């Protein structure tokens, strides 16, 4: 929910994908706070396709390989098999760091209380 100015005048991306076999998608966003976000499936911004509205308090992006784009948990829209991600975004804290994980699927238990994860537990040992 970093809401700043985007004075590109270069038709910038703010999020750029590379699909399998050299195909480019480039999505951008704005604000109103709702999130107007459009797309391009081209080399330049030849048109615009309306994705949706992201809710005002975004605090997790998630890019699956097949094309899933999770936001806050929910799957908002699918896409193509992703090869690489070219990104430029920030956060409203100016304090510490983010985390960008590289992650595999694994069966676990979760503790949910008020729709947020309380305590995680793994399933790897036979016990």
């Amino acid at each position: 929910s970093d809401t700043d100015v985007y004075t590109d005048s270069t038709t910038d991306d703010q999020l750029h994908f590379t699909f399998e076999d050299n195909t480019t998608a480039s999505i951008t966003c704005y604000s109103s706070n709702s999130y107007l976000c459009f797309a391009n499936f081209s080399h330049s911004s030849v048109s615009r396709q309306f994705l949706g509205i992201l809710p005002p308090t975004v605090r997790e992006f998630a890019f699956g390989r097949d094309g899933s784009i999770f936001v806050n948990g929910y799957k908002y829209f699918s896409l193509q098999p992703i090869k690489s991600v070219n990104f430029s975004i920030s956060s409203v804290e100016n304090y510490g760091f983010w985390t960008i994980a590289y992650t595999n699927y694994t069966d676990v238990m979760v503790d949910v209380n008020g729709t947020v994860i309380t305590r995680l537990f793994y399933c790897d040992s036979p016990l």
Partner: protein, 245 residues
């Protein structure tokens, strides 16, 4: 300069800070002051510094690399008025230089390549000295005006800051500090329960990656998130419906 850093403790770090939390703040900021009345402060470095002034005299800062051809520059005036206001512009000019001594509402160039403009209200709420500077990295321009931090994404090929005071006073004194930062300093915020200096316990660090210990960074010891960890930012990923309990 303990009190002056102690004033820097109060006003500058009251930008954002929530309660009961500590982090590892790294912003290229002050270490040792400078007072300058040369009125053409042509200095070339690698990031901005911060100025400081209480009296009612207009200011002007210009930020550029070399004189480019489409790479936009920064223009800014801090002028005293009924309310002391400040306008920042992002545009471009070939002609001119700041040996000026005029009045400066909007006075440097009508560049035909201009995209960003905003007239900010400087919050002169405190009677003590309050700091106002800027920062850029490579694509990423910072504003520290008044009560917030605002970000501009353009491009930064920037190494020449131009600062000047445009008035010929005969003989006046100015309580007036301005620095120019070309460094990579680090700090360590605290605010555990309140050390009552004002609310916190600062710590500058010497070299690298100090006792700040941001809880977001962990060590994936087995491929496994460590137990006893705030999941304020990790979610259950699904597509059908979320849980509640």
């Amino acid at each position: 300069h303990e009190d002056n850093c102690g004033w820097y403790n109060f006003v500058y770090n009251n930008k954002v800070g929530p309660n009961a939390k500590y982090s590892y703040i790294n912003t290229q900021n002050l270490n040792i002051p400078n007072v300058h009345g040369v009125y053409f402060d042509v200095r070339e470095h690698n990031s901005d510094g911060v100025w400081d002034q209480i009296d009612r005299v207009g200011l002007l800062i210009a930020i550029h690399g070399t004189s480019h051809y489409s790479l936009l520059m920064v223009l800014q005036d801090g002028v005293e008025a009924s309310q002391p206001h400040v306008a920042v512009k992002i545009c471009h000019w070939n002609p001119g230089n700041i040996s000026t001594y005029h009045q400066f509402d909007v006075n440097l160039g009508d560049g035909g390549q201009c995209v960003f403009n905003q007239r900010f209200s400087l919050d002169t709420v405190l009677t003590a000295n309050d700091f106002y500077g800027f920062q850029w990295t490579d694509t990423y321009v910072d504003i520290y005006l008044g009560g917030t931090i605002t970000k501009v994404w353009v491009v930064n090929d920037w190494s020449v800051v131009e600062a000047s005071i445009s008035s010929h006073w005969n003989a006046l004194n100015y309580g007036y500090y301005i620095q120019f930062v070309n460094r990579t300093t680090y700090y360590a915020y605290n605010s555990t329960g309140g050390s009552n200096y004002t609310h916190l316990q600062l710590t500058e660090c010497h070299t690298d990656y100090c006792a700040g210990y941001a809880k977001n960074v962990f060590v994936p010891i087995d491929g496994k998130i460590p137990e006893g960890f705030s999941f304020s930012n990790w979610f259950l990923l699904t597509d059908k419906s979320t849980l509640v309990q």
